[PDB]
Design a protein around this nucleic acid. Structure first.
Lengths: 90, 89, 78, 97, 79, 83
DNA sequence: CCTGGATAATCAGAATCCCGGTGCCGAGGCCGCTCAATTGGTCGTAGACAGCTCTAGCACCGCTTAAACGCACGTACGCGC
């Protein structure tokens, strides 16, 4: 089990005509984990700081706000908040 | 006091930046990232910022005075403070 | 408010770092860096205290922001 | 599929699994893995867009690690996020100082 | 003595890739210096993981975890 | 000035595999079995560290007016880094 | 004799395309198990935030002396050569 099929679905979504090599897929599959830890780790420490034991969507939001710089946070805060409202109103 | 003032503040341990203009600057920075509202700052939280920034500035100066003597200079320049902010990341 | 960091203050700061001849616009180079640093700590530190629905940055919110910056402050842990 | 409800391409149930079995907490909310998978999908699309543009700028139809290095190193927001990073078979930026 | 395996043309390519016009003489040994003190801090921190599990095959996972411990993460070797 | 624009556009390994493999296995016995994927993981990061250290030490070179590297260039760059 | 401009002779300045050979590679897509995400009943408890008290930050009002702004001289030193 890896992200090499779901990242490939994104690759065939934006710029679908181009491909990728097997080595770069080794990088990308690593890269998403580099995004996966530092946001979810710092959010978990956000649960440890202000006397909590629940990680809701508000924790990951300020975790992206604390980690991603500038507009890379300001556009990722509009991507997950759009997705959680679509998930709640299924 | 070239050989005198160098050996006094290093033996000393207290603050060098005044507390109240540093607190005013910290509040003027804090009102930027709070959408324009007043904000309470604890007495420990301002001294923490002061103790961090003073140590960071003396570390940046002691890491740039080694770049001063690298060019055969004894006069510190902003080229050394902008080079020390480049080999740190 | 940026001129609150006075000229012998930066002189004493560079004297603690061991600088003999402290230049001119260096005094404007320091408070600039002090504007760069103190922003980067405060942009995180109020982000921690806004999650707990609080309007006061404590010492711990400064410690967490500095631990995010890469330098661990010791003597303010409550 | 909970990712079809979120409108994503990243698996919601897998992100929730790595959030629950990954020793992060003991009570993970239902809004956390959807937000996390959306943030992952956005940033992978962001790096693949700059990788897909630099591939055609270098006249290539296949994304190489050099194209990923050109995607990372030619973006202010990506270089600030990825500070202590290195790329295998990606080289460096050509610059004369 | 395998410190001479890092040769002068290899150090020359490493310098010319870093934008160096004129390399000096000791730089062809100084590399052999720093690659003796950097890589060792990568080796032991990669073998202790090998000393943590019951194995003798030091995988690339131990290497990238050691490089994560030192503070320079590596891409292309996870899975 | 000739090959500077040659290796920056390229991506291949500058150091050969087997001398680097013997150099790594010389440190390995100081504390086994090395996969071929692990030797590349040891070599890529070390090469990219060496090129980046030379690039950051060349900024110490053009600070004094010089264009030639020096032993004080590789000892002053790692001083600010704390390594 | 001298002098304005016309043109006649000239060796010697580098790299580049191609035949002459190749040689083991590596990607996007199908079959369709299968088992881990779905759905759901059931347990199980976290802090929403509203009450409530309470140490503590804001702000002012404001005493004395340590400290900063800058002038003038002045010389050593980054840099020109």
């Amino acid at each position: 089990e890896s992200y090499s099929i779901y990242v490939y679905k994104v690759l065939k979504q934006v710029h679908p005509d181009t491909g990728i090599s097997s080595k770069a897929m080794g990088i990308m599959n690593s890269f998403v984990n580099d995004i996966f830890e530092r946001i979810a780790g710092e959010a978990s420490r956000l649960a440890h700081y202000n006397k909590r034991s629940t990680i809701t969507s508000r924790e990951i939001q300020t975790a992206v706000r604390l980690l991603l710089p500038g507009e890379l946070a300001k556009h990722a805060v509009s991507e997950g908040t759009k997705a959680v409202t679509k998930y709640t109103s299924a | 006091g070239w050989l005198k003032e160098i050996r006094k503040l290093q033996k000393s341990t207290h603050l060098l930046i005044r507390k109240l203009p540093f607190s005013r600057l910290a509040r003027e920075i804090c009102v930027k990232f709070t959408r324009g509202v007043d904000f309470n700052w604890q007495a420990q939280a301002l001294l923490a910022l002061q103790e961090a920034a003073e140590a960071f500035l003396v570390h940046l100066f002691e890491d740039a005075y080694l770049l001063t003597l690298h060019a055969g200079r004894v006069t510190l320049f902003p080229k050394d403070v902008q080079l020390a902010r480049r080999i740190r990341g | 408010n940026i001129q609150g960091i006075t000229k012998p203050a930066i002189r004493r700061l560079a004297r603690r770092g061991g600088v003999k001849r402290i230049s001119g616009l260096i005094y404007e180079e320091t408070r600039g860096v002090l504007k760069v640093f103190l922003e980067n700590v405060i942009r995180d530190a109020v982000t921690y205290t806004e999650h707990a629905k609080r309007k006061t940055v404590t010492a711990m919110d400064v410690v967490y922001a500095l631990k995010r910056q890469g330098r661990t402050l010791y003597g303010f842990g409550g | 599929t909970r990712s079809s409800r979120a409108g994503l391409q990243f698996p919601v149930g897998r992100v929730h699994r790595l959030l629950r079995k990954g020793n992060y907490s003991e009570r993970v909310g239902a809004g956390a893995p959807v937000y996390l998978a959306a943030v992952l999908e956005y940033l992978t699309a962001e790096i693949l867009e700059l990788a897909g543009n630099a591939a055609r700028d270098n006249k290539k139809t296949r994304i190489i690690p050099r194209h990923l290095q050109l995607a990372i190193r030619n973006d202010e927001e990506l270089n600030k996020l990825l500070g202590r990073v290195t790329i295998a078979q990606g080289g460096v930026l050509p610059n004369i100082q």
